[PDB]
Ligand binder design. Structure first.
Ligand code: FMN
Ligand code: FMN
Ligand code: MRO
Ligand code: MRO
Lengths: 313, 313
């Protein structure tokens, strides 16, 4: 009957927050997410300098979900750090800051500056391993040695508990390798599964055209298309990383979808496409709907069912 | 107006066929696919010996698609070779035979034996590369060195044009690398994109349980979930393999979905989940619906629009 929880030395009114990138780029957006009923908020992944991002149109949504190739538009790390150190009202809810530098050095340079603000104000770091395509090498989370370098360097530079935003994997050996990398780093205290399902292509039959301008129409998919992919990643890393938290992201449109993420192992549940489409009112509905399912089942706490998805035999 | 194609030295009344695995395991199944209005059929991916596959339930479907961990149940190579050599009526439509040996040596042994029947009767080989190799390693087509080995060995042992069935990829680096491997092999004349989107997890909220028994509920996804992933892969290989055909598979439930595949580059268009759910009557419906879109647009043949998806500016 209340959905409050405690994680990472912080108190949360409920497990919901925006997904990085959605409703979180400008001061106005971050004030809007803080005024909402969400339990937390995360800022737009940032780079050391500001970015315009890719040409428009760069996001489109449809009944089954969304496609985007935003290009990491952001107001620059100095802005997000300033929001964290001077503007955010911590009495309202916790703040996560997402960083997405284009090299290890850039990520290390941002985290060294974020550390004392984390100590003083309690902002939390979500390190985004996804990045614009560089011909000739894979995304960082898809190159396990690069991933290990990033986490070794960030962990050294930051020195405090943080989390990592992961793209989906689709192969059980990949789950085993990625979770073994993550388990080398004791400061990685949460894993957020998942970022968009990479490089889909939506085509409009009437116009015979792709629907976004960058990358010949290819972009990451979110929303209903990706819920079972998201639940599989959440559960695969919940099972493999027993000393970490898993934050679930992907496909959440209802309190039933949140319930499924929590059954698979999610501690917080992030909302991307559905929030972009419905606006911040969605958080009161998701809370009501999750409490309604809990009540029908007799559950009084999230702990009673987190990670307790049943297998057959 | 017409749906006819002539490719790989065969004539097809229309581009539709089953996806491997669906309606194609027994003699009864293959006679049913032959009696349908599809333009071709493919047999179930086989191994040297018969397999019972995994325990049930191992396939389930829902409004947005399906999940399966079948375990490669099949009647064994000798049965499908007999069907191709002695039973199929080639005056009705062309036959593809899919193989999925559990090692390069098993595939080599099958294709050596298939070769003389392919030469005499015109059966076409589809080699499934989205298939287990050594457990704890990724599936073959996610291990580029293994994939190259499989292709070198099968190309030497078989010596005739064949095609390959590919898992989806999600990273531009992988589209680049995979297409470069395929383009090393001139006998690979068609590339079928895509197999299921691997290791998703469907969870039923009422029962709090996964819905298939093997693999703790993890399985490959088909259907509406995967259409933009399928289209991205069809187009990515269509652009990168200009000397090969691309066949599309994933998410086809209507003539409009088939039209989008074909705009992305697809020659043949395969139907898995929707055919499993609706039965072979789907082919008359897909042909009617694709001809209606062609009529409205004034297209008289498939080559007028195949691969002609527009990009923005
Ligand atoms: C418009 C847009 C911008 C996004 N930007 C980011 C980002 O800056 N950093 C990040 O970690 N993920 C980003 N994402 C990914 C989302 O955080 C989320 O992982 C993905 O959309 C899946 O969740 P959903 O199904 O709720 O949309 C973005 C997604 C969208 C739709
Ligand atoms: C029950 C079932 C069995 C399958 N078995 C095979 C197989 O033996 N070989 C293979 O190449 N693909 C197999 N697949 C994958 C399908 O061929 C197809 O690639 C996938 O289902 C996506 O197409 P769809 O969205 O139309 O279902 C199977 C799919 C299903 C649902
Ligand atoms: O800003 C984006 O395009 C973006 N969109 C996503 O769905 N997830 C992300 O993490 C990002 C920022 C990193 C990124 C990823 C792919 C292409 C460009 C930037
Ligand atoms: O028989 C299968 O489970 C199967 N299902 C698919 O959706 N696609 C396939 O290619 C196969 C056969 C290969 C496979 C894949 C994963 C585990 C075992 C066999």
């Amino acid at each position: 009957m209340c959905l409050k929880l405690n994680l990472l030395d912080h108190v949360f009114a409920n497990p919901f927050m925006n997904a990085a990138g959605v409703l979180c780029s400008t001061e106005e957006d971050l004030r809007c997410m803080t005024a909402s009923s969400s339990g937390a908020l995360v800022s737009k992944s940032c780079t050391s300098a500001p970015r315009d991002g890719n040409p428009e149109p760069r996001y489109m949504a449809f009944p089954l979900g969304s496609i985007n190739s935003m290009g990491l538009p952001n107001l620059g790390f100095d802005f997000y750090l300033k929001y964290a150190s001077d503007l955010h009202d911590y009495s309202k809810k916790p703040l996560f800051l997402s960083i997405s530098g284009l090299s290890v050095e850039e990520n290390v340079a941002m985290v060294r500056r974020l550390a004392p603000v984390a100590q003083e104000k309690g902002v939390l770091l979500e390190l985004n391993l996804s990045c614009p395509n560089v011909p000739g090498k894979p995304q960082v989370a898809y190159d396990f040695e690069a991933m290990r370098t990033y986490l070794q360097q960030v962990s050294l530079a930051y020195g405090l508990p943080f989390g990592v935003k992961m793209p989906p994997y689709f192969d059980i050996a990949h789950f085993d390798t990625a979770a073994a990398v993550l388990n080398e780093f004791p400061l990685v205290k949460f894993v957020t599964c998942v970022n968009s399902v990479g490089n889909g292509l939506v085509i409009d039959a009437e116009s015979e055209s792709v629907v976004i301008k960058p990358k010949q129409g290819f972009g990451g998919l979110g929303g209903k298309y990706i819920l079972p992919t998201a639940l599989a990643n959440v559960n695969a890393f919940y099972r493999r990383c027993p000393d970490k938290l898993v934050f679930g992201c992907g496909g959440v449109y209802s309190g039933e979808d949140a319930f499924l993420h929590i059954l698979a192992g999610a501690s917080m549940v992030q909302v991307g496409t559905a929030l972009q489409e419905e606006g911040p009112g969605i958080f009161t509905r998701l809370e009501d709907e999750l409490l309604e399912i809990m009540a029908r089942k007799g559950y009084r706490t999230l702990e009673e069912f987190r990670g307790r998805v049943k297998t057959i035999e």
